[PDB]
Design a protein around this nucleic acid. Structure first.
Lengths: 102, 102
DNA sequence: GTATTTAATACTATATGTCATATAGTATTAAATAC
DNA sequence: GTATTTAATACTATATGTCATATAGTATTAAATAC
């Protein structure tokens, strides 16, 4: 049940990369990862669909607003407008490797 | 509706990276990205929580099975066991840049 | 690498009903590969 | 870079009810920064 950070991942990618007799400076790894997220965000804003086979797909989905909305704290009915949301849709490999988990 | 691929993203990261007077071979970019996904998957399998401050969080969630399940095609009642699923939970920046979208 | 500073998340209450789910076979198309 | 080959996705039917949602203020903590 641990909490992994962009930093840990960057370190792991460092390992993973060297395990295959390759050498890349954590510097460049951190760099790619940042550009990666930046690029993914803008891509999402443009309402594009990014697909990474064997992992998952990112896309924007529409979501109907409500009036029934509730303020968890007070119960006061709140209004929510029809908006859009970032959605990750799991790929075969990922979906199957996670299905039966302890 | 457009469709972006791991390849296009890799190219965009190439651009993004050079726009900031830096030079990294598409080779190494493709590399990081692959190790990135690899590492994220195993991290998910270990039922860890990966957090990328203001972008989103990945985590495994439990999902109750059913009997009511249906075969979209035939209507035949199907059974589904309690399992786990990969879930992406949008971060502030992402959730806000996507909210009001045409 | 470490110390400092800023701001994103976890946390929480608990009604409500939208939206992802289930299937499998065909046509695409991502993308790994060797060139 | 391009052509070839393999296998992951899009696509689709449409009942069902789980599960994410709304809020905001406090304590954490990711992580960008300059050293």
């Amino acid at each position: 049940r641990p909490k992994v950070t962009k930093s840990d991942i960057v370190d792991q990618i460092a390992l993973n990369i060297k395990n295959n007799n390759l050498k890349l400076e954590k510097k460049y790894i951190r760099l790619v990862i940042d550009a990666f997220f930046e690029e993914l965000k803008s891509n999402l804003c443009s309402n594009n669909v990014i697909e990474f086979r064997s992992f998952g797909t990112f896309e924007v989905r529409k979501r109907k607003g409500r009036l029934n909305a509730r303020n968890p704290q007070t119960g006061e009915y709140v209004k929510v407008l029809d908006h859009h949301v970032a959605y990750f849709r799991p790929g075969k490999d990922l979906k199957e490797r996670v299905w039966g988990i302890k």
